[PDB]
Design an enzyme around this catalytic site. Structure first.
Site, PDB file in Angstrom:
ATOM      1  N   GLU A 107       0.760  -1.225   0.090  1.00  0.00           N
ATOM      2  CA  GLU A 107       0.125   0.218   0.064  1.00  0.00           C
ATOM      3  C   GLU A 107       0.751   1.137  -0.047  1.00  0.00           C
ATOM      4  O   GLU A 107       0.200   2.373  -0.437  1.00  0.00           O
ATOM      5  CB  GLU A 107      -0.870  -0.047   1.209  1.00  0.00           C
ATOM      6  CG  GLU A 107      -2.175  -1.194   1.200  1.00  0.00           C
ATOM      7  CD  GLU A 107      -2.872  -0.972   0.240  1.00  0.00           C
ATOM      8  OE1 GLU A 107      -3.753  -1.725  -0.135  1.00  0.00           O
ATOM      9  OE2 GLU A 107      -3.038   0.215  -0.532  1.00  0.00           O
TER      10      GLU A 107
ATOM     11  N   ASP B 206      -6.239   6.389  -5.288  1.00  0.00           N
ATOM     12  CA  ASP B 206      -5.556   5.233  -5.378  1.00  0.00           C
ATOM     13  C   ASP B 206      -5.688   4.650  -6.568  1.00  0.00           C
ATOM     14  O   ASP B 206      -6.079   5.403  -7.726  1.00  0.00           O
ATOM     15  CB  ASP B 206      -6.247   4.269  -4.374  1.00  0.00           C
ATOM     16  CG  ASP B 206      -7.842   3.954  -4.530  1.00  0.00           C
ATOM     17  OD1 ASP B 206      -8.569   3.150  -3.744  1.00  0.00           O
ATOM     18  OD2 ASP B 206      -8.445   4.256  -5.646  1.00  0.00           O
TER      19      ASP B 206
HETATM   20  K     K Z   1      -2.121   2.541  -2.095  1.00  0.00           K
END
Ligand code: K
Ligand code: CL
Ligand code: CL
Ligand code: CL
Length: 164
Positions: free
Chosen positions: A11, A20
């Site tokens: 992440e 994102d």
């Molecule tokens: K991310």
């Protein structure tokens, strides 16, 4: 390696609101704020999540707090879900982390719908499960991350996370 290090790898860490891979406003270590296209709505979610008026920016400690909550939430979601709990209980510790990773990324309901893959994992048919998991929007949209998670399911090792 452990689930926190694994997800921190997948992440990243960003202290300002960013979009994102799906274009959704996110912050910290993959903390999804909202699917709304309104940055103002995302900032309101952030302030509510942190408990203070943020300028769209948080500290590393705040990002790690959201991350702890989100990992806990993924585990809790697995354990309360009638489709995911038996699979999770059947797995070894490394493959459990792979399942938590998937739930963190796409949510409890999303992963619970992978009926055929879940059956193959429960049956410990690791190569077949790995092939089936790749036949997915998940794999096509995030192939490098999906490959790492799939390799973890296939081998029961951290080989996909070692040299990174
Ligand atoms: K991310
Ligand atoms: Cl298949
Ligand atoms: Cl496909
Ligand atoms: Cl990817």
């Amino acid at each position: 390696m452990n689930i926190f290090e694994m997800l921190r790898c997948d992440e990243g860490l960003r202290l300002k609101i960013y979009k994102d891979t799906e274009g959704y406003y996110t912050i910290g270590i993959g903390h999804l704020l909202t699917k709304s296209p309104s940055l103002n709505a995302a900032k309101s979610e952030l302030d509510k999540a942190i408990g203070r008026n943020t300028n769209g920016v948080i500290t590393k400690d705040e990002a790690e707090k959201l991350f702890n909550q989100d990992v806990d939430a993924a585990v809790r979601g697995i354990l309360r879900n009638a489709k995911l709990k038996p699979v999770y209980d059947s797995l070894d510790a490394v493959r459990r982390a792979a399942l938590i990773n998937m739930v963190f990324q796409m949510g409890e309901t999303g992963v619970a719908g992978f009926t055929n893959s879940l059956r193959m994992l429960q049956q410990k048919r690791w190569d077949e499960a790995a092939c089936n998991l790749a036949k997915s929007r998940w794999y096509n949209q995030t192939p490098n991350r999906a490959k790492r998670v799939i390799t973890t399911f296939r081998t029961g090792t951290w080989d996909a996370y070692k040299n990174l």
